[PDB]
Each structure stands twice: as structure tokens, then as C-alpha cells.
RNA sequence: GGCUCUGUGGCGCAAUGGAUAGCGCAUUGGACUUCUAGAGCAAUUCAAAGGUUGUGGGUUCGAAUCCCACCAGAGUCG
């Protein structure tokens, strides 16, 4: 399940990052097909910033949505956080909607929380 | 240089007479539930403006006390202290001390009861109004602003704050604090505050072991360390520390308490 | 006697047995549904602390000093937190990662708190004369987010502290022996309301 | 112009007009540190003086809203008798309405009742009155207030959520703050756990977390940080 | 041994104005937000109850208020 993963071929393809960067990868690429249950799932690299962006859709129309993996060990300055911003951007390339990314921390506990970074102001729904 | 020569308000004899008058009942802010979201709405505009005359009204009103009650105090400048002129009221249960068979307070327990308006404070035969208080007494010589607004805040309330004056192991605060001791310089204790219940019988002179300990801090400066919080511990002794904290206004309390794992 | 593999840098059981006993065994590691993730410090701890937990690599047994060397490598904090790991779990607590807020470990009791965890802690290493290097910088708008995200989940900060002695060279650190010469100091940091606090 | 009264680096505005000048027309809310007349004896809501975050009296200083001046030093002794002519007069007249409403009065007033001359000060060099002159943490938090004072906006102190600075869409009076905006210089390295806890407790506050920064060449971005439950 | 100052709701106090007792904290209850029942600090907000005004006497169209005595408490002067 773990070791033998059709994605695992373009996961070492990649060569983007250190291994536990690609494990923590594919734990969150594992954790959202099969708990969160996304429609599909994409690893694509950024060697420019060196990560690993999972390019996801919830439901069968809602579009494009990016989930960034990184350990509790990286340190996100907010320049990497406006370079991510601006590369999802691109991966997008839906000026319709502002900058937004999910960035999903991981323990190697393998427990995982989400925190929705968007450019600009975002008024706290209800 | 050119100078703005502001101006400040004085009272007339209706005024005066109609302060005393006041009742206690305070406006209530807000007046209940805050809306979310500013639509520009022809109603919240009234709403707002009633919340801010209500304001203006509260914070247009002085204090007004008969000379009966007000106790003529007289700071002295280069003493340090508030000696008074007329024997004191029920506030000299708790306040102040006695020297020289004559009654004196130190600034910020002055300073609190001028805006109290227990006292009337003079200062070279000229009575002080509550801005020439805040500017004369509160400074690095005496009492800092910080200390005085803990020490207000907490007097507010009913507490009876004085000044103080002097397989791996499992360590605990207390231990060590001579080789410590000689490593200072940062937050130090200032305040012995004691509690409300103990206001009806509190003797200025044995009051025992105060109830906390505060130290004053800007919520700007460093958190102490362990070596800080550890000196801070043993001087404080059996009485726990509390760190007071003030951000622009606002205060907040924490203490640093030791503890031991229950074995499960 | 409990196989397992150090596979991409974690700790990883396979077999069905070994995990119902780690399971049963007060709770140890995370799983997916069922390959359980164990991490360094349970995995560490199981390894030395108890002995159960074997773990393999490149077809050959590792010397638990080759396993610190490896996990302070892939994980530079490794030793400290294992300390603290083990000053917690001697005590029958149920450290478990904890970085759902910004603490390390929540501490449980037993069974019927099951993950109820009433503290969190925040590990630091520090000298002997307690001038040691921040291991995760703190400031007071920091303790007070701490102190309010922890209250609203009914639990209470901790500042548990490591005190190494100036002859124990961190050179030494490659084994969990230094434990031995470890001494600990816990720190309950809460607020203290000024309204409340008039006796009772 | 207003006139405020910096002492120490303290900032305080004195005259309860002042105040309302402040609140109505510039939008800069402040807060009250002193005792009120009508409850003395309470922490519910206080009174005069307002107390101004040294953002707040330079950015005031600058848009030419209030002339801050430093406080005079204790020269007024030679400025005498004619108090006395002033308290004993009135209490001639006083006996007037006291008698014919059926011991004297004194008025406390929080302001300075006599006309004086200070000198002022510029807030854009460092000295023994405004030491927040040069301040890194001063200039990174103005520049912050600044761009979310001009988008309009009510700011506030916001320690004790962890932030830097509660923003509110109108007057907090009426509307609550909605973002916690800190305050992050470009290159400093954000703490994963700090971060956590902060986006934690903004969800549990229901206010989103800002990480605003200002970049070099200058202007502020903001990164709005919510929960992303899924 | 005198002198001075105090005693009001569970706690701290206001009412000194001679027209009868209110304010905050605490307690209880409601509304809202959040969390896994709890918590809520400008995500908080509102409302209710709570009284031998230390005891006796006296002046007065009325005494918490003014006066005297006593009881208790604090400080100070031997
Ligand atoms: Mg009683
Ligand atoms: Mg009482």
C-alpha cells in the first residue's frame, strides 16, 4: 500500500526535495484520496521553491485547489509564503479568484492539519 | 518656538451644584448585541451615534466632593511623599504610613486617591488638577506608569496592595537561589498584594504572609527565563509570584506556579 | 521482538500482531484506517526503554546508538523531546503529539480519558545555570495565545524545562545514558484573573 | 489643532473634545486608562485621560491632525493668588444657591484649568520623550497601521489575542474586530507552532489571522490565514 | 491612659443632601460565539436577587447623615 503506489513513480520522478519531504507528500496525498475522498490528485513539483504541490478537486466541478505538504521542521518566511501564493496562482490561472493555497502540516506522528492561506482580507464566515 | 497654549474647562456653581446629584448607575456600552458587518445601514448609523453621545456624555463629567470630605494633602518634591495636612479617613486603614508622628503616602497611593478623589492634593500652595498629578508624580524617581495603572487596577477592586520590601531527577523552583541571587537585573518584585476579605481587619504593621506577589511588565519586554523566573521565586518565598503585564491599557495576570506529576 | 521498518526516514509496523499489541499497549503510534506510523520517540522508546520494538534496516538489526545517530539526524530536536518523552511516560502519562495547537505533548492519564488530555508542554533544553539557547522562541503575546487556545480546550500550558549539568558534554549525547544525568522542572503557566481571585 | 500631552513616550489626551475629535473625524479610538467620576471604584469602564499606542500619535502627528507637545516642566509657583480670589468668591455665591434650595464645593478636574505655554517636539528623531524613534518594532508596526488605517478601518491593541493589532471594519463600539493582524517583517521566519496557535485561536475568537508585511520597496500585503476544515 | 480615624448587601464602596438605600466583583438566570458537558479576556452581551445602614438615647415635618454614650477594629502618642 505504502512502498508499492503507482503515484511513488512520479514521486521519486520528480527528485524535488528531501525524502521525508516526498513521504509527507504522499501521506497527505494518501490521507486526502482515501479519507477526505477527492474527486482526483496530482503530485506536481516546483524545484524553483522545492516543494511539492498536490493539485486536487473536491467535487466533480469545483476547479483547481492546491494542498502544500510541509513538516512542522520548515520554516516559512512570509516571502515563501507570497511565492507560494504566486505559484498557485499559476497553477491555477484563474485571475476570477485571489491568490489561495492550503497548507497542510504534518507530524511524523502522520496527523495533519490544513490552514487556507489567501491573499488579501478574508471576512470570517459564519 | 511656537507654542499651541491650550486651554482647559472649569466649572461654574450650577455646574458644581448639579454634579453631586449624579447617580452611580453606569450607561451601559454597546447597548447589547454588535453588528457584524457595516451595510451602511440608515439605522446603525443612529445606533452608532447614540453609542458615541452616550460616551461623550460619561466622559464630560468631573469629580465634585464637598471640602469636608476632602482630606488636604501637600506633596513634597524633593521628600518623595505625600505628607497630609488633616488626619485621615477610613483609606488610612490599608495606606500610607506614619513618620515623625505624621501621616504620609507614597506617590501612587497618593496619585489613587486624588483620582478617587479621596484627598485633595495640593503642591506649592496651589491645588493640583488631575493632568499636573499624573505629570509630577508618576516618573523613573517614583512609581512608573505601569506600576501605578497595576496598582490602581488592582485597588479598584478591593485588594489591599502594599510595597514590598527585602531515569532523569526532578528539581523545583526554590531550589537554588544564592548563587542566583547575585545575577539580577530585570523583573524585580514590586507589589505585596494582599486580598479583599482581609481589608476589614488588615494591620499595617504585622499583616503576614502577603496573598501574591506582583511583578510590572510591558507586554513588549522579553519573557523571563527560567534563571529570571527562578531568582524571582526564591525572593518571593513561600508567597507565589504573579507577573502583571500592561499593553497600552490593558492588563493581564499570570503566574508562574511549580508542579509535580501525579505518578499514574 | 516486534519487526519493523525504518522506511523514508519513519517508523513503520506491518504485521497484524505486533500492532494489536502497540495498540494494546497504551495507545502507541497512529494509524491509517492498516500500517501503523509509529513516531522516533514512541519508536526509540520502545526500542530501548522496554525492548519489544525491534527495528531492522538494509536486512541487518541497528544498535540503538546507530538508531540515535539516524533520528537526531533526521530530526535535530530528537534527543531533547525524547527526554522529555521519557520523563512523561515513566510517570504512566500517555504523551502524545500534541501540535494540533502550538504545544509538543498532551499528557493523559489512563483508558477512560481516552485523548480527553489535560496539559500540553513546551520542551526547552537549558543549561545549568538556565541561560540555555530558546529551542522555540517565546513572547508574552505568544504565552498569552498559548494560555487562551489551551483554557478554551480545557487543559493547562507546561513549561517542562531539561537541565543538563556542565560536565555532561552534548559529544555524549549519541546514547540515551545521559538520561541517567538529566534533571527535569515543570512550570504550570495559567492566567490569573483579577475579578475572580478576591478568596473563597 | 489638538494638542497631546507626551511624557515619557506616554501619550494622552486630556480634554474629552479632544476625544471626540479623535473618535468622529480621524477614527482613532484609543483607550481610557483613568477612573471614572460618576464609579470610582470599578474596572468596567474607565474615563479620561485616553491613552494613544505611539502608532496612533505619529500617525496623527503626521496627517497634521494634532500638534503633539511635550509636557511642561514645574515652573507655575509664580502664577498665584488669584486662585484664592477664585475659590472664596464663588463661595460667597455659592451660600446664594445652597440657602435657597431648601460646606462649599471643590471641583477635581482632570485637565489643566490655567492657560500654558509648551514647547513642541518631532517625533521623526530619537530622545528622552519619544524613544520610539528608530524602534525596528515601532517602524514595522506604524507602517502596518498606517495602510490599514488609510483602507478605513478601527485598530486596537490586541495582546491578549496573540496579535498585534484588532481590526475592525467600524467603530468598535459598534462592530466586531474582525482580523488579528500581526505584524512580520519580510525575512523573519515564521514559527510553524506559534502559527498554528494563533490560526487556532482566531477560529475559536472568530477572527481570521493576518499576516501583514511591508516589502522594501513599500506597501503592506496582507495574508489572510483561516481554518481549512475539509 | 489620652488622641485621631472607621463599622451600610457575601466582599470593596457611594449616597453627607437631613426626604430612605444604590454601584462593581461574587452567585443565579437568559442570549450569542466556540470547543470536545466545558470555555468566552473590547466574541461577547443582558437581566435578577442580594439590607439587624454596629447598639441605645436625643434634636428635628423626616436621621445612614447631626450630637452624646457604649461595643468592636486600625493607627499614634507613654
Ligand atoms: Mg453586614
Ligand atoms: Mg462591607
Redesign the pocket.
Given at each position: 500500500w505504502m512502498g508499492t503506489h503507482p503515484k511513488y513513480l512520479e514521486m521519486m520522478e520528480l527528485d524535488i526535495g528531501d525524502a521525508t519531504q516526498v513521504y509527507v507528500a504522499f501521506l497527505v496525498y494518501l490521507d486526502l484520496m482515501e479519507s477526505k475522498s477527492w474527486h482526483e490528485v496530482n503530485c506536481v513539483g516546483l524545484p524553483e521553491l522545492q516543494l511539492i504541490c498536490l493539485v486536487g478537486t473536491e467535487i466533480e466541478g469545483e476547479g483547481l485547489q492546491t494542498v502544500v505538504p510541509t513538516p512542522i521542521t520548515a520554516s516559512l518566511s512570509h516571502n515563501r509564503i507570497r511565492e507560494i501564493l504566486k505559484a498557485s496562482r499559476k497553477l491555477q490561472g484563474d485571475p476570477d479568484l485571489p491568490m489561495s493555497f492550503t497548507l497542510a502540516i504534518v507530524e511524523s506522528d502522520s496527523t495533519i492539519v490544513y490552514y487556507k492561506l489567501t491573499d488579501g482580507f478574508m471576512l470570517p464566515d459564519? | 518656538a511656537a507654542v499651541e497654549v491650550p486651554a482647559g474647562r472649569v466649572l461654574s456653581a450650577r455646574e458644581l451644584?448639579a454634579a453631586?446629584?449624579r447617580?452611580?448607575?453606569?450607561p451601559?456600552?454597546?447597548?447589547?448585541?454588535?453588528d457584524?458587518l457595516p451595510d451602511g445601514s440608515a439605522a446603525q448609523a443612529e445606533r452608532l451615534r447614540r453609542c458615541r453621545e452616550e460616551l461623550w456624555q460619561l466622559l464630560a463629567e468631573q469629580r465634585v466632593?464637598?471640602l469636608?470630605?476632602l482630606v488636604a494633602a501637600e506633596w513634597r518634591p524633593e521628600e518623595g511623599f505625600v505628607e497630609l495636612k488633616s488626619?485621615?479617613?477610613?483609606?488610612?486603614?490599608?495606606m500610607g504610613?506614619?513618620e515623625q508622628?505624621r501621616?504620609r503616602l507614597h506617590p501612587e497611593e497618593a496619585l489613587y486617591l486624588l483620582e478617587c478623589g479621596?484627598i485633595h492634593l495640593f503642591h506649592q500652595d496651589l491645588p493640583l488638577s488631575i493632568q499636573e498629578a499624573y505629570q509630577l508624580l508618576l516618573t523613573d524617581h517614583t512609581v512608573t506608569f505601569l506600576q501605578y495603572q497595576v496598582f490602581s487596577h488592582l485597588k479598584?477592586?478591593?485588594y489591599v496592595v502594599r510595597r514590598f520590601q527585602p531515569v532523569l531527577q526532578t528539581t523545583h523552583l526554590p531550589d537554588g537561589g544564592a548563587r542566583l541571587l547575585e545575577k539580577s537585573g530585570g523583573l524585580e518584585i514590586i507589589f505585596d498584594v494582599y486580598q479583599?476579605?482581609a481589608?476589614?481587619?488588615?494591620?499595617?504593621?504585622?499583616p503576614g504572609k502577603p496573598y501574591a506577589r506582583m511583578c510590572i511588565s510591558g507586554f513588549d519586554e522579553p519573557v523571563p527565563d527560567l534563571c529570571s523566573l527562578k531568582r524571582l521565586s526564591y525572593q518571593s518565598g513561600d508567597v507565589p509570584l504573579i507577573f502583571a503585564l500592561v499593553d497600552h491599557?490593558?492588563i493581564?495576570f499570570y503566574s508562574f506556579r511549580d508542579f509535580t506529576l501525579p505518578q499514574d | 521482538i516486534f519487526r519493523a521498518e525504518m522506511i523514508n526516514n519513519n517508523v513503520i509496523v506491518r504485521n497484524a500482531e505486533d500492532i494489536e499489541q502497540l495498540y494494546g499497549k497504551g495507545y502507541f503510534g497512529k494509524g491509517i484506517l492498516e500500517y501503523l506510523q509509529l513516531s522516533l520517540e514512541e519508536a526509540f522508546f520502545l526500542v530501548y526503554a522496554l525492548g519489544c520494538l525491534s527495528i531492522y534496516y538494509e536486512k541487518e538489526p541497528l544498535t540503538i546508538v546507530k538508531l540515535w545517530k539516524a533520528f537526531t539526524v533526521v530530526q535535530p530536536t530528537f534527543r531533547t523531546t525524547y527526554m522529555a518523552y521519557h520523563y512523561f511516560r515513566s510517570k504512566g502519562w500517555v504523551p502524545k503529539v500534541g501540535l494540533?495547537y502550538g504545544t509538543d505533548l498532551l499528557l493523559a492519564r489512563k483508558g477512560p480519558p481516552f485523548?480527553?488530555a489535560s496539559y500540553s508542554v513546551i520542551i526547552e533544553l537549558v543549561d545549568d545555570h538556565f541561560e540555555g539557547s530558546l529551542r522555540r522562541p517565546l513572547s508574552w503575546k505568544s504565552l498569552?495565545a498559548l494560555?487562551?487556545v489551551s483554557?478554551?480546550?480545557?487543559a493547562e500550558l507546561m513549561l517542562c524545562y531539561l537541565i543538563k549539568p556542565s560536565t555532561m558534554t552534548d559529544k555524549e549525547m549519541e546514547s540515551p545514558e545521559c538520561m541517567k544525568r538529566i534533571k527535569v522542572q515543570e512550570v504550570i503557566l495559567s492566567?490569573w484573573?483579577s475579578?475572580?481571585e478576591?478568596?473563597? | 489643532m489638538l494638542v497631546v500631552e507626551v511624557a515619557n513616550g506616554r501619550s494622552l489626551v486630556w480634554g474629552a473634545e479632544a476625544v471626540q475629535a479623535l473618535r468622529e473625524r480621524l477614527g482613532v479610538?484609543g483607550?481610557?486608562v483613568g477612573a471614572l467620576p460618576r464609579?470610582?471604584?470599578?474596572?468596567?469602564?474607565?474615563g479620561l485621560p485616553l491613552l494613544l499606542m505611539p502608532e496612533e500619535a505619529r500617525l496623527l502627528a503626521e496627517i497634521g491632525a494634532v500638534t503633539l507637545v511635550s509636557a511642561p516642566r514645574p515652573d507655575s509657583r509664580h502664577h498665584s493668588l488669584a486662585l484664592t480670589s477664585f475659590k472664596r468668591q464663588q463661595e460667597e455665591s455659592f451660600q446664594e444657591q445652597?440657602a435657597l434650595?431648601?460646606?462649599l464645593l471643590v471641583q477635581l478636574a482632570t485637565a489643566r484649568p490655567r492657560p500654558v505655554k509648551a514647547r513642541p517636539l518631532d517625533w521623526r528623531v530619537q530622545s528622552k520623550d519619544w524613544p520610539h524613534a528608530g524602534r525596528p518594532a515601532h517602524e514595522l508596526r506604524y507602517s502596518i497601521y498606517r495602510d490599514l488605517w488609510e483602507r478605513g478601518f478601527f485598530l486596537?491593541a490586541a495582546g491578549?489575542?496573540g496579535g498585534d493589532f484588532?481590526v475592525?471594519p467600524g467603530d468598535?463600539?459598534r462592530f466586531?474586530?474582525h482580523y488579528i493582524a500581526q505584524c512580520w517583517a519580510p525575512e523573519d521566519t515564521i514559527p510553524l507552532q506559534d502559527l498554528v496557535a494563533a490560526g487556532?485561536l482566531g477560529?475559536?475568537?472568530?477572527?481570521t489571522l493576518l499576516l501583514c508585511s511591508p516589502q522594501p520597496d513599500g506597501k503592506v500585503v496582507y495574508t489572510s490565514l483561516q481554518?481549512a476544515s475539509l
Open positions: 459564519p | 451644584f453631586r446629584s447617580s452611580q448607575k453606569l451601559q456600552r454597546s447597548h447589547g448585541p454588535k457584524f466632593e464637598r469636608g470630605s488626619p485621615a479617613g477610613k483609606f488610612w486603614q490599608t504610613f506614619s508622628g501621616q479621596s479598584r477592586l478591593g479583599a476579605d481589608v476589614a481587619t488588615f494591620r499595617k504593621n504585622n491599557g490593558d493581564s | 494540533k485523548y480527553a498569552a494560555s487562551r483554557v478554551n480546550v480545557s492566567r484573573v475579578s475572580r478576591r478568596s473563597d | 479610538g483607550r481610557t464609579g470610582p471604584r470599578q474596572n468596567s469602564r474607565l445652597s434650595a431648601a460646606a486596537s491578549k489575542f484588532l475592525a468598535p463600539l466586531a474586530a487556532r477560529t475559536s475568537v472568530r477572527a481554518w
